[PDB]
């Protein structure tokens, strides 16, 4: 097992709109690779 963690303060309220869409993006250039997602879960709670 090899793990990596990262964190920062991001004031979401100031950057994205009230309603959003979530997703994935991948790109290739002159050098490339296949980018695949095998599983995905999501949970949000707005009080």
């Amino acid at each position: 097992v090899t793990s990596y963690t990262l964190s920062d303060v991001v004031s979401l309220k100031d950057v994205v709109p009230e309603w959003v869409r979530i997703g994935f993006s991948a790109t290739t250039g002159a050098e490339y690779a296949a980018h695949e997602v095998l599983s995905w879960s999501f949970h949000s709670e707005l009080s």
């Binding site: 869409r21 979530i22 994935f24 993006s25 790109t27 290739t28 002159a30 490339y32």
Partner: protein, 181 residues
């Protein structure tokens, strides 16, 4: 109170609850953003809009996302561009390709982009990537120049388990990436 939750452990050939953009599609029970081909972009979004904050109360949502991803390069030393998880406006469409990851258009701060992304960047872009040239995980806010980065050693063809969580109490976004090794 408003909650939104989903779990997908195997993708179907016609996964109607996702929106595909660019080359994204599903195959062999996986979501493929890009095949191993030059100069392409693929994006996939969950169908439903998500209520992330409210102007009425000022409340912001807590959220958590888990996914397992794989990068499969013909050559492990010659890779490129990277992959992201992102949050954007409802009507989001692909932005600039290549080192912009299909999400941003500039290394300068653009408030109009209204996008937050967690990148897994596989190619050093001298204009904005960390000078050590290491592949890296980054937190991107309205720009391809990350607000914070961590060196990451790509494991070609290996499954990476990612957890991203946002804590509304503190405005902290946390990313964890784990390889079986």
């Amino acid at each position: 109170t408003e909650t939104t939750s989903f779990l997908i452990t195997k993708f179907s050939p016609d996964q109607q609850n996702l929106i595909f953009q660019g080359d994204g599609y599903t195959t062999k029970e996986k979501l493929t953003l890009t095949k191993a081909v030059k100069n392409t972009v693929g994006r996939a979004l969950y169908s439903s809009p998500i209520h992330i904050w409210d102007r009425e109360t000022g409340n912001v949502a807590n959220f958590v996302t888990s996914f397992t991803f794989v990068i499969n390069a013909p050559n492990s030393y010659n890779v490129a561009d990277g992959f992201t998880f992102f949050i954007a406006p409802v009507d989001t469409k692909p932005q600039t390709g290549g080192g912009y990851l299909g999400v941003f258009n500039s290394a300068e701060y653009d408030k109009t982009t209204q996008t937050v992304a967690v990148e897994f960047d596989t190619f050093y872009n001298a204009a904005w990537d960390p000078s050590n040239r290491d592949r890296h995980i980054g937190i991107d806010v309205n720009s391809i120049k990350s607000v914070n980065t961590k060196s990451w050693k790509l494991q070609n063809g290996e499954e990476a388990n990612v957890v991203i969580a946002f804590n509304a109490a503190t405005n902290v976004l946390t990313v964890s990436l784990t390889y079986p090794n």
